[PDB]
Amino acid sequence: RTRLLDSEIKIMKSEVLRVTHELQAMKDKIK
Amino acid sequence: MQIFVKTLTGKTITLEVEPSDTIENVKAKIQDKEGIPPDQQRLIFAGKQLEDGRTLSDYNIQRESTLHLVLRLRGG
């Protein structure tokens, strides 16, 4: 198991972008 | 290590961080120097947007590289 730690870094970074993604649409609907 | 935070006001901010630190800790350090909360802070490295969920190493941010500082600008 070598690339399992590198592919988990790509999953954890994009999943944190989804936290700002739902926050992007939740903020756009007020204005 | 030291890094550079360059504003658009011609002002350069230096911070002592570690390469494994998250971006929100760096924004907390910016709040420690300035008092601006991190939701009003935006950081750009070589034209790329920084996300608080990742580290400096994820964007290959190293010793004394130059950031950009743009502020949240909402009106009304």
- Looking from the CA of B52 toward its CB, the CA atoms found within 13 Å total 12
Q: What technique determined this structure?
A: cryo-EM
Task: Note whether B58 contacts A: Cβ–Cβ < 8 A.
Answer: yes
Q: Do B54 and B74 form a contact (C-beta atoms < 8 A)?
A: no
Is B2 within 8 Å of B18 (Cβ atoms)? no
Q: Do B54 and A19 touch (CB under 8 A)?
A: no
Number of A/B CB contacts below 8 angstroms equals 17
> What residue type is A12 in one-letter code?
M
| Alpha-carbon gap, residue B25 to B41, rounded angstroms | 12
Q: How far is B67 from chain A (nearest CA, A)?
A: 20
The verdict on a CB contact (< 8 Å) between B51 and A13 is yes
Cα dist. B16→A9, B38, B62 in Å?
A: 25, 17, 11
- Rg (C-alpha) for chain B, rounded Å, is 12
Q: Are B63 and B1 in contact (CB under 8 A)?
A: yes
Specify the pairing of strand B41-45 against strand B66-71: antiparallel
Q: Residue B30 is inside which H or E element, if any?
A: helix B23-34
Domains delineated in chain B: 1-76 (3.10.20.90)
